Amino acid sequence: MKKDIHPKYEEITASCSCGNVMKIRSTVGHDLNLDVCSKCHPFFTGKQRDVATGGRVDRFNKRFNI
Template sequence: MKKDIHPNYKQIKTVCTSCNTEHVFGSTAEKVNLDVCSNCHAFYTGDRSTVKARGRVERFNKILEKSKKTN
């Protein structure tokens, strides 16, 4: 391998914007933004039912808006 052509691999700290949990991992990037992590994502927490319910409510509200526009 050629010398001095590879990016520097280092340990970086980043904070999840949803739950403010700090994570440390290796990366070649200077800064990484996390919107959702394994501590707050519905798939990992087992709170998937609320996500489904929220989707149903949003879908109902869209249908309700359409019916109000046609009347």
């Protein structure tokens, strides 16, 4: 690369809430502290929530009850 025209690209440490602590290189400045990550995101359960659209006739059976 050219010198002295690029941002300070240093190695920082990123710690998510799920426990995945990872070592990257970025211009944050140091010590990024995350909340969610790749193995913390609900892409395996949370994507399916409104996919479960629910019924309408069972709601009737939750009100008829007989």
